[PDB]
Amino acid sequence: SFELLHAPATVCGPKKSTNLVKNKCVNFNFNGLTGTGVLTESNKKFLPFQQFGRDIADTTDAVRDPQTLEILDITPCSFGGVSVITPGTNTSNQVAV
Amino acid sequence: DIQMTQSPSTLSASVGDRVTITCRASQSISSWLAWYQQKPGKAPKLLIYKASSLESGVPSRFSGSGSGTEFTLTITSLQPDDFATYYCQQYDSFSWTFGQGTKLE
Amino acid sequence: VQPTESIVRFPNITNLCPFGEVFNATRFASVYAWNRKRISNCVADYSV
Amino acid sequence: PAYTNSFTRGVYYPDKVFRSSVLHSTQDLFLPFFSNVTWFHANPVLPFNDGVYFASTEKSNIIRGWIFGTTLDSKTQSLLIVNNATNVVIKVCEFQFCNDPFLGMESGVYSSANNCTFEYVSQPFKNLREFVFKNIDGYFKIYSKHTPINLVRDLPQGFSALEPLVDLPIGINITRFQTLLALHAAYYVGYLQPRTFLLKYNENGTITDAVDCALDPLSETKCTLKSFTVEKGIYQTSNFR
Ligand SMILES: *[C@@H]1O[C@H](CO)[C@@H](O[C@@H]2O[C@H](CO)[C@@H](O)[C@H](O)[C@H]2NC(C)=O)[C@H](O)[C@H]1NC(C)=O
């Protein structure tokens, strides 16, 4: 018999988790912060009660892994533009990128 | 499991005397006890079942007592054929663990 | 660059609720004398 | 009773975010700088407005507990935070207690064991003890700090930040507050207000300074420029109406 909620609940199921892959672009959830990025080891020293780091523009740039308390750094996945360099089709059809 | 300590040990007494042995339990068990008789070179023989209950074919001198944790076996009159080994047993949980044992002579 | 894997991390699973011990019992209570066990403040895995 | 002036005290970490070498601007419940706080020496029941800042310049054993509630009767809950020599117990329990309770086995627990809900045991004049109690959105938050000070009657000159202790889901209401003196000797109480602050996180993430965004015009200028140093000139800050 599940006594329904009359006071804040204290019993429910465990929350599963995956392995910690590093140095690859991975969608990530760390105790509820969600985002996509590349996770790498960090030399930051958060105080004991501090979980995640925000920068000057208020963007999260670090998370502490919940199970092993290691500070990790979030760096955005590579993005940019592609340009084609050509000597003009009047001379050749060989290009560079 | 259940850890059950047989406090009495190798004991010496004359023939025809009161003898009492105790078999303390780690935690209380509701009189789920068995006493076993053992002789050297002989297979174990069932002696007493369900704490204080005598089995058929056993002399009346043996008697059991104790509730929860203070289980005890008492023999009013000692006999020369009574010089042998006694084994404890409990069957409250499924992990059925015996006792250390006691020696008589 | 597109993401390849997907990970989630959560604290250690600690303090499991002990309903397993009630389910496997050498002694079972009689129907008229039903016994109530209160499971409270623990992690309960109903998938087992 | 008497009043004493708080000299830039009552600042705490408002989140669990790590900021390095930043001048952050926050808006939350803080104790205004240079404010009068009542001085008590020995403790009747007191109100609880959005939280409270409690300072005690005593160490031995006298101050080891608090009680919280709105309309304390045999029906409403009550927070117990009484401290032992090696443990503390968090007992939010539905009871009432007799007038003038204290610690002599407790005086108020003669009937104060009624239909209780939640239990917790976590935490086991030379040192000043500073605490901040907050109750909001069904959550009770404790901030605490320990500082070695001497030869001060009012609060010491300096800056210190109050790290967070516990966040507990009591899920009840609290309006009255009282202390449980171990009657077998001075403390200070201040009220929080919604204020805007300019916190100065240093390299390691520790708050080093703060500015009250409404103290005086110069503080408003610093708060607008988001810097602790301004140079000669005229700066527009606010709007008069
Ligand atoms: C969460 O669980 C992990 C895995 O059991 C813990 O990691 C171990 O921690 C101990 C204690 O320091 C180490 O001796 C082991 O070497 C660790 N295991 C591994 C594989 O590294 C971790 O400490 C737990 N954390 C919390 C907060 O409970």
UniProtKB/Swiss-Prot annotation, chain C:
Changing residue 20 to D: In strain: Omicron/BA.1, Omicron/BA.2, Omicron/BA.2.12.1, Omicron/BA.4, Omicron/BA.5, Omicron/BQ.1.1. Glycans are attached at residues 4, 6, 12, 24. Residues 1-16 are annotated as: Disordered. Changing residue 24 to Q: Reduced viral infectivity. It comes from the Viruses. Disulfide bonds join 17-42. Attaches the virion to the cell membrane by interacting with host receptor, initiating the infection. The major receptor is host ACE2. When S2/S2' has been cleaved, binding to the receptor triggers direct fusion at the cell membrane. When S2/S2' has not been cleaved, binding to the receptor results in internalization of the virus by endocytosis using host TFRC and GRM2 and leading to fusion of the virion membrane with the host endosomal membrane. Alternatively, may use NRP1/NRP2 and integrin as entry receptors. Binds to host ACE2. RBD also interacts with the N-linked glycan on 'Asn-90' of ACE2. Cleavage of S generates a polybasic C-terminal sequence on S1 that binds to host Neuropilin-1 (NRP1) and Neuropilin-2 (NRP2) receptors. Interacts with host integrin alpha-5/beta-1 (ITGA5:ITGB1) and with ACE2 in complex with integrin alpha-5/beta-1 (ITGA5:ITGB1). May interact via cytoplasmic c-terminus with M protein. May interact (via N-terminus) with host bilirubin and biliverdin, thereby preventing antibody binding to the SARS-CoV-2 spike NTD via an allosteric mechanism. This is Spike protein S1. It comes from Severe acute respiratory syndrome coronavirus 2. The gene is S. The chain holds residues 320 to 367 of 1273 of the full protein.
